[PDB]
């Protein structure tokens, strides 16, 4: 049996978010808090649609992971060590599909991987330039006005 916890983050009303970005309105959305297992760590993701004029990350989708205080925290090791696979799923036709993803190794020396003293860790870990918005028109990443972001954690 597999051991990794996998969360599927459904971001709906995406067309609206894209419209805002195109009108130079900031877009930053947090995923609901989710667990990597039972017992497991509690995390949430933070996704940005950077402004079209954003210096150093114009028109880019940014994606980060943040640790949160979870109910199983007393039974887990700290700081967190392991890998986190972030994927924006291709919802294209039956034939071969090509998702957009990155895999990151946790850096135990960073505060992002410690348990926060408040519900959501201020410090997160991720990619400022995860995927360019232009990539969204290259494949069917948006389906039924929804974007699918997959987060797989391996301890």
């Amino acid at each position: 049996q597999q051991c990794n916890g996998i969360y599927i983050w459904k971001i709906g009303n995406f067309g609206m978010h894209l419209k805002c970005q195109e009108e130079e309105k900031p877009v930053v959305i947090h995923s609901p808090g989710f667990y990597t297992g039972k017992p497991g760590y509690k995390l949430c993701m933070r996704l940005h649609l950077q402004l079209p004029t954003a210096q150093r990350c114009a028109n880019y989708i940014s994606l980060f992971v943040h640790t949160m205080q979870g109910e199983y925290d007393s039974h887990l090791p700290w700081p967190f060590q392991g890998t986190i696979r972030l994927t924006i799923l291709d919802q294209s036709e039956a034939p071969v599909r090509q998702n957009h993803e990155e895999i990151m190794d946790a850096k135990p020396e960073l505060l992002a991987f410690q348990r926060p003293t408040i519900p959501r860790n201020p410090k997160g870990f991720g990619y400022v330039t995860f995927m360019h918005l232009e990539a969204l028109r290259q494949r069917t990443f948006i389906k039924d006005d929804t974007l699918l972001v997959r987060c797989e954690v391996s301890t």
Binding site: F64, H66, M104, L110, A112, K123, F125, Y127
Partner: peptide, 8 residues
């Protein structure tokens, strides 16, 4: 590239 720590 490599991921980075980012504060929000």
């Amino acid at each position: 590239q490599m991921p980075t720590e980012d504060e929000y």
